[PDB]
Amino acid sequence: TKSTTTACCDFCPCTRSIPPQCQCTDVREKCHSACKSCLCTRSFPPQCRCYDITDFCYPSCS
Numbered sequence: 001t002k003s004t005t006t007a008c009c010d011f012c013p014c015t016r017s018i019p020p021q022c023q024c025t026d027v028r029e030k031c032h033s034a035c036k037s038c039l040c041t042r043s044f045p046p047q048c049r050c051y052d053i054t055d056f057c058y059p060s061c062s
Contacts, residue, residue, distance in 0.1 A: 008061030022055060027048075032052075039051065
């Protein structure tokens with residue numbers, strides 16, 4: 001008992017628009033606990049990916 005796999009990211013790039021929109025371009029196992037766009041590749045292995053739109057970035061995942 002301490003913590004768990006919360007809403008994370010790894011690579012968190014953003015647009016330089018007004019306002020700026022930040023996203024995740026992470027690719028791993030399943031997507032995190034704050035994804036509105038989540039989608040996977042059909043490849044082998046099929047890896048799942050989060051493409052959320054937030055104003056900000058989340059801490060590093062595992």
